[PDB]
Structure 1
Amino acid sequence: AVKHLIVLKFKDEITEAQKEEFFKTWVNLVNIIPAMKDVYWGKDVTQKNKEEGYTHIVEVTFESVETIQDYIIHPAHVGFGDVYRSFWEKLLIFDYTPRK
């Protein structure tokens, strides 16, 4: 089991309603993309690193790093990326297996 983590900042012109619609859409992909096992998102409330600007976190769960590729190329995901391409300003991506 691997987590695909995204840390993101939206463009300034994007409204809160748009952001919530964006995340709803992303969460709803789980239903239609077999490789996606789970999605959670959240807004940062502490703002400990404002100079960096990142505001939101998204966690997508996969059975393996391998199967992330099946999600990346799935038509529903490609379409999601196309539709919302104007929304994001910058992001960090991480893939890891959570452990103790």
Structure 2
Amino acid sequence: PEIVRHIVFNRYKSQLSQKQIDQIIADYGNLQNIAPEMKEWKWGTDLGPAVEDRADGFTHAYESTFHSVADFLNFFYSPPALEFAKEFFPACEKIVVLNYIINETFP
């Protein structure tokens, strides 16, 4: 059990301004600058019913990557990871989050 991904989708609460949504993304970002375990941070916004209409109202998507299920646990119970979770989850109107061990292989 070595490489695990953290994929979050959310929607934001309609009351929040962009300035605030921006400050929240940015904080998620430089989480890397405080948490060493956190690794391959990517975010982005669903390209709409235009392309494919199965976002069920989810708007954003965020990937974080880790070098051992052990590094993932150490992070998720650390001051910063918990600190930042109080900022972020309270701003979500929809939330869904999968950690999985990364698998390139079929069955």
Which of these two proteins has the greater Rg computed from alpha carbons? 2
Corresponding residue number in structure 2 for 1:57: 61
Q: Contact (CA 8 Å) 1:2, 1:98: kept in 2 or not?
A: no
Corresponding residue number in structure 2 for 1:39: 41
Corresponding residue number in structure 2 for 1:91: 95
Corresponding residue number in structure 1 for 2:19: 17
Q: Contact (CA 8 Å) 1:22, 1:84: kept in 2 or not?
A: yes
Corresponding residue number in structure 2 for 1:81: 85
Cα distance in structure 1, aligned partners of 2:20 and 2:103: 31
Q: TM-score, normalised by structure 1?
A: 0.86
List alignment gaps of at least 5 residues for structure 1.
Answer: none
Cα distance in structure 1, aligned partners of 2:62 and 2:27: 12
Number of matched residues? Answer: 99
Q: TM-score, normalised by structure 2?
A: 0.81
Deviation at 1:74, TM superposition (A): 1.2
Matched letter for residue 74 of structure 2: D
Cα distance in structure 1, aligned partners of 2:40 and 2:77: 17
Matched letter for residue 59 of structure 1: E
Deviation at 1:65, TM superposition (A): 2.4
List alignment gaps of at least 5 residues for structure 2.
Answer: none
Q: Contact (CA 8 Å) 1:9, 1:53: kept in 2 or not?
A: yes
Q: Contact (CA 8 Å) 1:71, 1:77: kept in 2 or not?
A: yes
